[PDB]
Amino acid sequence: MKIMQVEKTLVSTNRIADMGHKPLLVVWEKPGAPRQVAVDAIGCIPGDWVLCVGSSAAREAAGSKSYPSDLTIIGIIDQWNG
Amino acid sequence: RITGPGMLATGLITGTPEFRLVCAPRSDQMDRVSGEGKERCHITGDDWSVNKHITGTAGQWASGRNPSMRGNARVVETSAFANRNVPKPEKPGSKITGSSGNDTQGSLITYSGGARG
Amino acid sequence: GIALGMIETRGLVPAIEAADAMTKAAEVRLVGRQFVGGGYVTVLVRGETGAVNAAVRAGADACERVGDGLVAAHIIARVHSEVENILPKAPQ
Amino acid sequence: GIALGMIETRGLVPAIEAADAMTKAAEVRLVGRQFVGGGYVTVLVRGETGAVNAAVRAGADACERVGDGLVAAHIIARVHSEVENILPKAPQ
Amino acid sequence: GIALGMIETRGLVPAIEAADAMTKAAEVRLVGRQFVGGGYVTVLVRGETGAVNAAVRAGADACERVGDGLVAAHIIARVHSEVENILPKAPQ
Amino acid sequence: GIALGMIETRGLVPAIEAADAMTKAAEVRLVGRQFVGGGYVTVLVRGETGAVNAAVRAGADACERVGDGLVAAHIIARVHSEVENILPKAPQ
Amino acid sequence: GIALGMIETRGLVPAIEAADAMTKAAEVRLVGRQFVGGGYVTVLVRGETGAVNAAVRAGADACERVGDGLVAAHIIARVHSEVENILPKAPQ
Amino acid sequence: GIALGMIETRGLVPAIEAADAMTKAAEVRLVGRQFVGGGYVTVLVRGETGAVNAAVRAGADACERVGDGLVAAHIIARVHSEVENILPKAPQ
Amino acid sequence: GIALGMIETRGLVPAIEAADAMTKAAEVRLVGRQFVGGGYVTVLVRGETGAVNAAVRAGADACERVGDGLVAAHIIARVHSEVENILPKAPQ
Amino acid sequence: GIALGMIETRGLVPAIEAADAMTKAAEVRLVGRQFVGGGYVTVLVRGETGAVNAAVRAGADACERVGDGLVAAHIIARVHSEVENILPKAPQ
């Protein structure tokens, strides 16, 4: 798992039906770092330090063993200073 | 004997000295006029609908005016939709080996001479 | 005329229909429409006894099949002056 | 009038009918008509004890077949002094 | 246009939908939205008879699968001047 | 006495009856009556714990057969100070 | 953004959950929370169509199992100008 | 903190009790009590995540057998800034 | 009021209950308690006629199952001035 | 304390037993022992509600098999203020 900060929301209107109704966030390890997209399974707001799961673990965390996520937020870190 | 408002709502009024789905399912109904001319939804009040007593604009009043005859012409549609189930010959198979993008499960692709692509 | 006519309905539509039908039927004045809670709406008319009789019956017939329907159609020929305090005068 | 009478109905029309019957029946002052929530209406009358007794009997009989009907007819001969604070003084 | 078209819903979402559909379906002026109590919401439109006829059919069709749905679809072609007092003029 | 005793009823009449009963049964002060929505009404008393206990038990027996009756009788012996801000201080 | 998204719920907690999930999911502005009557709560968002689509889809899934649940989840991409008058501009 | 804990109950008594179990259990501030319509009451707390968590678990166990009981028990760790505008800030 | 309500019991406990119950029930004043011999005990209440009917009905129902219970529940709506001399005036 | 506990016995010995039990059990003051007539003896306790409840339970269980035994065990949490005039303040 990685620790990332939510930067913004991401919207893709044409995305594949398998993503369901899941929200998508732009996350980066740090301001200015490379941007990744994570499924938001929790409900996170911009500026939050969140914990991100990758691989197969991401799929189940995002609702199913067959979900199309390789990156899912799985928790907000109560206190983190980055 | 006496008609007027006194004959209404009998059995509903109290205080008198004597006392003292809207829309019809889509599967079941198909509308004669679609759009704003639909009738599937019950509209109460002063709507434009016509009851039993009413005669005159459509029906025999439109259909009886001009004489017509219907033939029994020979009708067989020739179209892409009609040809959807046209007999087709046996689909070609591919016997090639070697890496060639040889998918057998997708849509049918053909090559020159009818070959499977 | 001091006779009170009253229609109660489940929903506003039957109430508006009732009010329209009543005032069209007879010489009555519309004095209020009240939202009671739970979806009850009451429409109230004033006028002379017969006019209110004709009106309330007209409203009842009119709104019975409308929406969720009629709850009450009631007449009081003369209300006690105490009850004037809980009756609307004009509809605002 | 120390006494208190209350009638509760489903809808306003039975409440009006109850109020009228209560006040015609006996020397009781209507002090409130309350929209409780959910369709409940309460009418409250004050008066001398026997007057309240008679007024709540009448009310109950008057409103019972009107609309959605009667929920409660109740008499409290002398309410505790604390209760007086939650009691309406004049209908609003 | 002085005809009234009215839609009553269980919930606000079906009401907003009825409203949008009605206003898009015909030349009708939306004059009100009313919270009636208990979850009922009524949308009221005005316009000419044909327009209203068309608008209410559109609202009904559109809102019926939305939320808790449709209670009533109704038209009053000619509205009595008295009822106008209980009819919202412009929605607020 | 700082304990809180509460009774909730379906309708105002059981609530008034409960309040009368509670103040009469024990050394409790009435601090509120709240219309909660949907027909629920709540009566709140304050006092020493045992008094509140005697009172709520009496309010419950008294209201259970009045109208639509009782929903809840509850006691809270020490109210956290945060809860005091949502509690009515004296009855309106 | 001029598209509209609306979520209706049975109870207020599912409404907040839906509102939070919408606002988190995309760039929509929450412009209103309406207490409809009867326990219906509606939440309205406004923004660009895609954002709105995403926001509603997310809120619907988020509040469906919260409390008493979801009633409706609706999107109106282009809103008739008449319907703007009945739509809240800022949350109260 | 900015976590939000919410309990929604059928009736006010379970709500006060939930508010009370919640604020005793953990360091949370009660920012609100809300009458939703239809009998639903919501109590709202705020605090750090752990605290809100502990409060919502305590409040939910406490109100479940009180009155008409519990409808929902929900937590949101980090409330979106748009949702803050539909949230009560002081109970009042 | 000058009406006399009287209750007679077998033993003091039912009499005290009778007295409490009568005074709580209606606007009556307790004027006396008399020990009679043999265990008979009499409570007396004065007040307006209706208030005394209400008070004695309550008193009777209250002491009947208490201890040895009720012997007599009687009302006199006007007392002759001669009987006033053998009547206790102020209790104790 | 405002609450009143009373035990009534057939004879003095059960009364003394009840008294001793009541005062041992809880903090209550013995305010009166009364010879009623006919052999009824009444003991009276004052204190806080719970203290009275426990004392009367203890008193009643204790004296039931002593002598001719028990007649009544009765509790009034708050007597009407008039009933105070007929209650003893200290035993004679």
Author numbering:
A (entry chain v): 1 to 82
B (entry chain X): 712 to 731, 773 to 869
C (entry chain A), D (entry chain D), E (entry chain F), F (entry chain C), G (entry chain B), H (entry chain E), ...: 6 to 97
What does the paper say about this structure?
Among diverse BMCs, carboxysomes are specific CO2-fixing BMCs found in all cyanobacteria and many proteobacteria. The carboxysome uses a polyhedral protein shell to encapsulate the key CO2 fixation enzymes, ribulose-1,5-bisphosphate carboxylase/oxygenase (Rubisco) and carbonic anhydrase (CA). Carboxysome shells are typically composed of three groups of structural components that form hexamers, pentamers, and trimers. Here, we generated recombinant α-carboxysome shells of Halothiobacillus neapolitanus by expressing all the shell proteins (involving three CsoS1 hexameric proteins and two CsoS4 pentameric proteins), together with the C-terminal domain of CsoS2 (CsoS2-C) that mediates shell assembly.
The cryo-EM structures of T = 9, T = 9 Q = 12, T = 13, T = 16, and T = 19 shell assemblies were determined at 2.3-, 2.99-, 2.93-, 2.75-, and 3.04-Å resolution, respectively. The resulting T = 9 shell atomic models closely resemble the T = 9 mini-shell, with root mean square deviations (RMSDs) of 0.33 Å over 928 Ca atoms. The T = 9 shell has a minimum of four different interfaces, whereas the T = 19 shell has a maximum of 10 different interfaces. In the T = 13 shell, only F3 (Arg712-Arg731), F4 (Arg701-His732), and F5 (Leu773-Gly869) were identified, whereas only F4 (Arg712-Arg731) and F5 (Leu773-Gly869) were determined in the T = 9 shell. Intriguingly, the smaller T = 9 shells involved only one conformation of CsoS2-C, whereas the second conformation of CsoS2 appeared in the larger T = 13, T = 16, and T = 19 shells. From the current density maps, shell pentamers were all assigned to CsoS4A, although CsoS4B was detected in the midi-shell samples via mass spectrometry. Therefore, all structural models of the midi-shells were built using the sequences from CsoS1A and CsoS4A for hexamers and pentamers, respectively, which are highly conserved across α-cyanobacteria and some proteobacteria. Fortunately, the density maps for the T = 9 (C1) and T = 16 (C1) shells were retained at good resolution. In contrast, the T = 9 (C1) shell map did not display any additional densities, suggesting that the CsoS1A/B heterohexamers are likely absent in the smaller T = 9 shells. Nevertheless, we cannot exclude the possibility that the possible loss of CsoS1B signals in the T = 9 (C1) density map may be ascribed to particle superposition, instead of symmetry-related signal suppression.
